[PDB]
Amino acid sequence: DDTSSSINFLTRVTGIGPSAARKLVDEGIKTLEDLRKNEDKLNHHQRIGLKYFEDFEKRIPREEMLQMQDIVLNEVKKLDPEYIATVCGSFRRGAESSGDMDVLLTHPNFTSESSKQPKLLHRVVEQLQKVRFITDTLSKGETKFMGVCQLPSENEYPHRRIDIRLIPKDQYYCGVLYFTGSDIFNKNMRAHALEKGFTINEYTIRPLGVTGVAGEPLPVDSEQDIFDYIQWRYREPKDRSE
Ligand SMILES: [Mn+2]
Ligand SMILES: [Mn+2]
């Protein structure tokens, strides 16, 4: 009812999951002013979401993402040019506006065999924070970081969501592909690959076999190699709507 209407509002909060939104109702937390008066019931994540609830509802204009991406890129280069960093999402596809910035990141040092190099990501984050670009963190794993950022005012920008992922270099490409979408796109493509006897995922492309349950990741060094294995002309991201 007008109360279910309540849980619906909660979940609008980044961090607030249903079961998590639910209990807060059983606590008599419904509107938002409720929540502000009740930070203590919330985790760091949720607190942040709450913190930026408004802004988080606003969309990112690509004139904005552009500058974002430049900042992110120039910072990572200065730390180690051997760093690969690509802003994926519809944004990559040319989208006129975006919801959040999401950066895929890699390094040759780091590969699907290593698997343990937090410092790799961390250093970036830190450099970003030092920059005053990242501004808060919702969470922050060895391999992933979700947070907030903001362009630099000279006089102000909204705070945006940002995600940074660390992928082993031998998996990066697929991943870039993958986070590039669109979803149909991925779908049609894995579909195709399959015709051609190949199985793709966000991590790797693999040849199938008899009975079907098969594989063993082919080497990828670019998105192109993906398309090449499946012998499909290469689609630049803009041409990826489907
Ligand atoms: Mn995202
Ligand atoms: Mn703001």
UniProtKB/Swiss-Prot annotation:
Q: Which residues bind Mg(2+) 2?
A: 100, 102, 163
Outcome recorded upon mutating residue 101 to T: 50% loss of activity
User: A single GO BP annotation from the record?
Assistant: pyrimidine dimer repair
Signal peptide range equals none
**Record-listed K(+) 2 binding positions:** 11, 13, 16
Q: Which cofactor does it need?
A: Mg(2+)
Q: What is the effect of changing residue 100 to E/S?
A: Loss of activity
The family annotation for this protein states: Belongs to the DNA polymerase type-X family.
Free-text comment on this protein's domains from its UniProt entry: Residues 239-252 form a flexible loop which appears to affect the polymerase fidelity.
The name this protein goes by in its record: DNA polymerase beta
Q: Which organism is it from?
A: Rattus norvegicus
Q: What gene name does this entry carry?
A: Polb
- Residues shown, of full length: 91 to 335 of 335
